[PDB]
Design a protein around this ligand. Structure first.
Ligand SMILES: CC(F)(F)c1cc(F)ccc1-c1sc2cc(O)ccc2c1Oc1ccc(/C=C/C(=O)O)cc1
Ligand SMILES: CC(F)(F)c1cc(F)ccc1-c1sc2cc(O)ccc2c1Oc1ccc(/C=C/C(=O)O)cc1
Lengths: 214, 210
């Protein structure tokens, strides 16, 4: 974990990427929720396989692994959502067969627009895939900490910087972009909080799930 | 305007803009905190107006940023004051509450303690603190409304790095510490949302700015 170079870290994260799942082959509030709920359920399974391939995660106790996934699972789904929705302005790509707009469930339009704004921010910054997988790993490891983990987090920070330095950015630009990316995570946390609020205002067996994976 | 300020000039402006540490009046624990928060809000507006680049913004934008960040700013201030008091939160010098003094807020309290311990373990400096508080003000509501904000945010980033470089930290330790600090802002946002929904369980901002 702490032995990996920045390049080894990147390739390991890239190859550990979860597959793009499909929705079940007009919508109502109930039907829309059912599709999204089912999609998220099947995605959680792959998220666990991905998490167990994130450097330093399996080094943790099963107790800590459950706690980190329980806190970050919606954040991870959301950043995954806004990432694949980058090439679709004004639209969210939940699934290749499920591309929705603003007009496409009461109480969700606020978080929907927040996800759209985040996607536009990534597109404006021209977020790269190598940067995306680093941000996703950070979310997993940081969302539920409150010195092994912090050292792994520092390693991912070095990896991000390495990617920016290799891209030709000046050290000032490296620090600025790093700051810009990590501040977005605060907004992703915000969207998750509102999401966890609204959703639980069917798919929560991460403790159950992770244990049956063993 | 503020885009011409140096790192040291940015620090000096923020340090001198710092709000005073208010006192509590010499169950009803909520009443005291509500009153304290009310009086702190007035000074927060004065502080915000002195944050470099904040007055260059639309007033409606100034209001939006303040309403989105006001609890985050109150909390990071609390965490800052409580740094030298392990296991306690210093809402006021005469209002120092323990963990068990903290229905349901014991969760919010523990998160505030944990944040206080981290800043203590990181040995957060005052110059770093005022920068973090400035970031919170400018970043918390930027995705719920122009490019001026991001420019100002970029120079606060420049300021933070400068402070770390002056402290003697290596260039690797600089971006690592920068990352650690900003990741804590995510948890502060989390505490605010959890706090905001408990206060649940703001158009007067324009008046104070008018
Ligand atoms: C706006 C919105 F739809 F994204 C959205 C707005 C919110 F307030 C909250 C969540 C969302 C999301 S984002 C996520 C991204 C994707 O990769 C896949 C699914 C969707 C998921 O839909 C979901 C997600 C989880 C559940 C769980 C319910 C249960 O356990 O009973 C139900 C529907
Ligand atoms: C008490 C606590 F910190 F745990 C806590 C847990 C939460 F879930 C949410 C907020 C808090 C806090 S943090 C803040 C830090 C300080 O500088 C000053 C006061 C306190 C404030 O007490 C408050 C703050 C605001 C209000 C608003 C009431 C209204 O508008 O009517 C009421 C009480």
């Amino acid at each position: 974990a702490l032995s990996l170079t920045a390049d080894q870290m990147v390739s390991a994260l890239l190859d550990a990427e979860p597959p793009i799942l499909y929705s079940e082959y007009p919508f109502s509030e109930a039907s829309m929720m059912g599709l999204l709920t089912n999609l998220a359920d099947r995605e959680l399974v792959h998220m666990i396989n991905w998490a167990k391939r994130v450097p330093g995660f399996v080094d943790l106790t099963l107790h800590d692994q459950v706690h980190l996934l329980e806190s970050a699972w919606l954040e991870i789904l959301m950043i995954g959502l806004v990432w694949r929705s980058m090439e679709h302005p004004g639209k969210l790509l939940f699934a290749p067969n499920l591309l929705l707009d603003r007009n496409q469930v009461e109480g969700m339009v606020e978080i929907f627009d927040m996800l759209l704004a985040t996607s536009s921010r990534f597109r404006m910054m021209n977020l790269q895939g190598e940067e995306f997988v680093c941000l996703k790993s950070i979310i997993l490891l940081n969302s539920g900490v409150y010195d092994h983990i912090h050292r792994v987090l520092d390693k991912i920070t070095d990896t991000l910087i390495h990617l920016m330095a290799k891209a030709g950015l000046t050290l000032q630009q490296q620090h600025q972009r790093l700051a810009q990316l990590l501040l977005i995570l605060s907004h992703i946390r915000h969207m998750s909080n509102k999401g966890m609020e609204h959703l639980y205002s069917n798919v929560v067996p991460l403790s159950d799930l992770l244990l049956e994976m063993l």
